[PDB]
Amino acid sequence: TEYKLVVVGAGGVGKSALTIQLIQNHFVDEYDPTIEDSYRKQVVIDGETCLLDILDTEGQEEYSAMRDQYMRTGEGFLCVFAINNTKSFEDIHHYREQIKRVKDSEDVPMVLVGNKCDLPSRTVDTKQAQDLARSYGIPFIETSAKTRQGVDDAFYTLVREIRKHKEKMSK
Ligand SMILES: Nc1nc2c(ncn2[C@@H]2O[C@H](COP(=O)(O)OP(=O)(O)O)[C@@H](O)[C@H]2O)c(=O)[nH]1
């Protein structure tokens, strides 16, 4: 059972930077003799083997055919905005609604992430984002890919949200 994590949000909010920081501290080699290299790289987060995908919808991915496929396949979603980019925060609701529509479910594991919290130019207050997360019923954390503040915790929290969802669906 790999946990399938998807990182979603506006262009330039730091999705790649966050994911690279996570992989750097959580990748391992795994022995697998049924593979014609005998070892593969895996990411292990809070004891779980995880797959990682980044969903962009702007830039080159404005020409993509894959947006809904990423939402169907992902099991939990890091919904990233940047604390110095009001429009990226306003975009979050559209991403969340789209995920709910594609997955046809109201309880989708998700964590709201306010990235670039090292920056002094802030236009999205912590309380604004906390209120949004509370309405959705999901955790909120502020992160910095530059300082590593919050990065591990954001992904660990998402893994726990997926775990609790899998435990519920099993029951
Ligand atoms: N100061 C600061 N810059 C960041 C942070 N995360 C990403 N960046 C910068 O923001 C820009 C976009 O980051 P990127 O990972 O390419 O965002 P993506 O388009 O969402 O994948 C790059 O210049 C990054 O170096 C952060 O936490 N703090």
Side-chain angles (χ1 to χ4, degrees), residues 103-122:
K103 301 189 77 63
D104 207 10
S105 169
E106 307 104 294
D107 67 330
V108 176
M110 305 188 193
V111 175
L112 181 66
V113 172
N115 190 44
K116 316 195 181 185
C117 71
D118 58 287
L119 290 179
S121 50
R122 173 184 293 267

Side-chain angles (χ1 to χ4, degrees), residues 126-148:
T126 302
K127 180 266 290 180
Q128 270 176 281
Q130 186 178 54
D131 289 342
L132 178 59
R134 190 166 60 255
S135 183
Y136 295 164
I138 70 179
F140 165 59
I141 186 171
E142 292 193 348
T143 62
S144 171
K146 177 166 190 283
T147 68
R148 297 196 100 242

